[PDB]
Amino acid sequence: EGMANQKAPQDDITPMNVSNRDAEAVIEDWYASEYADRSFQNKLAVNA
Amino acid sequence: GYAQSERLGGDISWENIKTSYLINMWMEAGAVVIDPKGLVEVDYLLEP
Amino acid sequence: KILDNDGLHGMTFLGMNFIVIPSMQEGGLPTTGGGTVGRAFFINEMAVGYAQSERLGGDISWENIKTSYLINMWMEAGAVVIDPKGLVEVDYLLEP
Amino acid sequence: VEEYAKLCAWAIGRRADQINIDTIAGATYSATPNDQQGALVPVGTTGF
Amino acid sequence: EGMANQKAPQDDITPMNVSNRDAEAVIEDWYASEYADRSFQNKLAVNAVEEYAKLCAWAIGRRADQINIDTIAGATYSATPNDQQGALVPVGTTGFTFEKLRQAHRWLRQRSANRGKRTVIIDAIAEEQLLNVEQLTNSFYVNQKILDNDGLHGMTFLGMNFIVIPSMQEGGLPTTGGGTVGRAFFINEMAVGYAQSERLGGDISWENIKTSYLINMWMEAGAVVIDPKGLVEVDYLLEP
Amino acid sequence: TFEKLRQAHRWLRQRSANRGKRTVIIDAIAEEQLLNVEQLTNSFYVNQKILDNDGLHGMTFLGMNFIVIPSMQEGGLPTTGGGTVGRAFFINEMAV
Amino acid sequence: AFGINYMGRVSTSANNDTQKVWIYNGTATGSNETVATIAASGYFNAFMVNVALGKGPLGVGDLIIINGNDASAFYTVQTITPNVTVSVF
Amino acid sequence: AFGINYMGRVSTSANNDTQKVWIYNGTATGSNETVATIAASGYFNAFMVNVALGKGPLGVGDLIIINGNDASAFYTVQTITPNVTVSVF
Amino acid sequence: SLALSQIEIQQFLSEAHAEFQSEGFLLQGAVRTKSGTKGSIVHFPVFG
């Protein structure tokens, strides 16, 4: 976060320091799976 | 900060060896706390 | 002038063509004497037969069960010595 | 996938060379060969 | 490297595993700058800004060479190397002879690093000794007469191109053994990676406060050894 | 000797002064000693045959032109070491 | 001797960071050799590509179900170079 | 601790009405822990999704082939909640 | 601010390098070759 300050005319500008940092997120892999046997294709009214 | 490389991937395949369809959804994401100043925890009694 | 060229690789001397085999994880040129004696071979073309049924086949498929791509390449061939009279072996010290 | 396809092609090519080398080196070599043996130049005490 | 194996018919495939690794190049920034006061425009017979722009570009170019040299010379070289080490040809008791050229070429051939562009970087002293080798200067060994020409600079031998590095204030080619042993390197092109974020940037601006032209040039690059199997080092005595 | 000639060429190369026209000024004694060098007089190494010509005077070697200065009453090429050591000079054209 | 047609794989996973399970048919319908012969040192050398460098489909710790012509036993690979040696599970 | 990269399936069948077979690599190339350490209670808790409710890939009765850095043995899953515990087979 | 060095990035190149290895097929045509063969065994008759 910066800040505004004052200075005399014709004087060099004096910046207010702005900090920095980093945050790291680790990526994960998840699987949701199921099987539908062909034996149930013709035996179910629901589309499995 | 929540980073999702893959919100909802997947692939539905016919597996001849198992004589069945394989429904295989997946995701790829990870999360991190960017600024702890924005988090507040409220604790309470389940049976007051 | 083999020094303006690839050296002994591909040179022709006394009518014989030279091939330089690099080091190979499959074994390359075999060694003897506990790894201190190298073996080089002189072959007449008709002394060895090479039967090739498939030079390079392959297939790349998606395997949903393993959630992986399977890269699969194959060859199919065999070899035999037609005539040992056309084979010469030279043994040399690797560090003379 | 592209790198693996390229690497697997070279592996097949190296096996084709190894089949030839194994057959050639698999013969019986003697310094006084008969009709079924290749000729041998003994190592002695020198290099090539 | 992959590998081919055998299996029974209708059996599941069993791959031979391929290894992986990574190489990291660290980027650095360098500046070559100069000032040219406006009061010198009418007092000089030469163009100061034009000369300074040329001199600054040479300073940047010399640093770019130094970065490549430092990476190559900084690798690990062993006389019995493994897959992570470059090959070393020990100094022994001789200078840069024809024997050491054969041994260096042997390592490149053995490790399948003898295809493509191969470069031999040597310094002035190495060239001076190599000019005494019969196999490089006799016209019955090579189809050129380097003694009628620029010497080893630009010469091709066994398919490798020679580059002679002069003595640079940036450091040039390093030595070893208390300044008595020189080092020369045989590099396959793919063996070393050179990341070039900014080859030669710059800005020539008028600074009213200082009443001067500021010729400012900069560069931004780094290098790393990718595959040590394509690197060979040859050691020789500076005074054989 | 040939070694000294190679060292002089080394110094020009090392100090980035080996491009363009280069001249070597030597006296008669230097030419006499340099005529013993095989690499300067043999067609194996150089195209010209200086022994069928004016010798080192006017020859070109490694891109450098040789000039032989005779004895001059004005002084000629200076000596050193009490008159027992000769001095020869390698000059890049832009250096003077 | 070793016959590749009698060698099969049991484990279905292709994950190479874990071990594999094999099954060998040395019974009368296979190689027709005893469990002791199959478990001898260097018997599975032919199954490897370069046994001198330990390059092949067998890994250290792999479980082999050996069905000899007289009995059966579980075995585990200990070395793949310079020879393939197994031990009782 | 438990590493998912060292766990792999052995049973090829997708039939969910029968048990599964697993294999774990705790040898020098894997987790580098003894069989006793791996067979301790709650070691395979990280493999489950919610061990407090017994929700995960492992089921009761599944056979695990454990390869420690000192030996190898067969183990059977006894419970999946509130901890994953195994006993010899 | 010089604090910008805390959020410096890294670049990963898409062009992979395969370790120096032989591409094989070096002995192609060096011996008597029969192409497009069929069968488990190929027989070469020989006369003495």
Residue A25 C-alpha from the chain's centroid = 8
- Spatial CA neighbour of G37 closest among G61, G82, G73: G73
Residue E138, SS3 per DSSP: coil
For E141, the closest chain F residue by CA position comes to F44
Supply angle C-alpha E117, E88, C18, rounded to 5: 55
For I48, the closest chain D residue by CA position comes to D35
**CA–CA dist E151, E149 (Å, integer):** 6
**Dihedral sign computed on CA atoms, order E77, E78, E79, E80:** negative
Cis geometry, peptide bond prior to residue H82 (ω within 30 degrees of 0): yes
Q: Which residue has the tokens 């690789």?
A: C9
- Contact with chain H for residue G28, Cβ under 8 A: no
Do E62 and E200 meet the contact criterion of CB atoms below 8 Å apart?
Answer: no
**Quick check: A25 and B18 CB within 8 A?**
no
Contacting partners of chain D (3+ CB pairs under 8 A): C, E, I
Residue G29, SS3 per DSSP: coil
Terminal C-alpha separation, chain E: 42
Tokens of G87: 């031990």
Supply angle C-alpha I15, I20, I25, rounded to 5: 110
Q: Which residue has the tokens 């000019």?
A: E131
**Dihedral sign computed on CA atoms, order E102, E107, E108, E111:** positive
**CA–CA dist E52, E58 (Å, integer):** 10
- Other C-beta atoms closer than 10 Å to the C-beta of B47 total 3
Distance from CA of C67 to the nearest CA of B (A): 9
- Spatial CA neighbour of I28 closest among C79, E108, H59: C79
Tell me the chain D residues in contact with residue I23 when contact means C-beta distances shorter than 8 Å: 10, 13-14
Provide the residue type at F57 as one letter: H
- Spatial CA neighbour of D43 closest among C84, C31, E102, C18: C31
**Quick check: I19 and E1 CB within 8 A?**
yes
Please identify among residues 134-193 of chain E the ones whose CB lies closer than 8 Å to any CB of chain C: 135, 141-144, 156-159
**CA–CA dist H57, D1 (Å, integer):** 29
DSSP secondary structure letters along F41-83: H-TTT-SS-GGGTTTTTT-EETTEEEEE----TT--S-EETTT
For I18, the closest chain E residue by CA position comes to E1
The CA-atom distances, in angstroms, between C16 and each of C44, E109, I31 are 9, 21, 13
**Quick check: I32 and C46 CB within 8 A?**
yes
- Contact with chain A for residue B36, Cβ under 8 A: no
Length of chain I, please?
A: 48
Contacting partners of chain E (3+ CB pairs under 8 A): C, D, F, G, I
Buried b vs exposed e over C54-83: b needs ≥16 C-beta within 10 Å?
A: eeeeeeeeeebbeeeeebebebebebebbb
**Quick check: H10 and G15 CB within 8 A?**
no
Distance from CA of A44 to the nearest CA of B (A): 14
DSSP secondary structure letters along chain H: ---GGGEEE------TTS--EEEEE-STTTT---HHHHTSTTGGGGGSSBGGGTBSS--TT-EEEEE-SS-EEEEEEEE-SSS-EEEE-
**Resolution in A for the shown PDB structure?**
2.1
Solved how?
cryo-EM
Tell me the chain A residues in contact with residue B32 when contact means C-beta distances shorter than 8 Å: 23-26
| Backbone dihedral angles phi then psi of residue A2, each to the nearest 5 degrees | -90, 180
- Contact with chain G for residue H65, Cβ under 8 A: yes
Residues 6+ apart with CB under 8 A from E109: C7, C9, C20, C22
**Quick check: E5 and G57 CB within 8 A?**
yes
Cis geometry, peptide bond prior to residue G82 (ω within 30 degrees of 0): yes
Residue C52, SS3 per DSSP: strand
Tell me the chain E residues in contact with residue D14 when contact means C-beta distances shorter than 8 Å: 4
Q: Which of I32, I35, I38 sits opposite C49 (nearest CB)?
A: I32
Distance from CA of E134 to the nearest CA of F (A): 9
Do C13 and C3 meet the contact criterion of CB atoms below 8 Å apart?
Answer: no
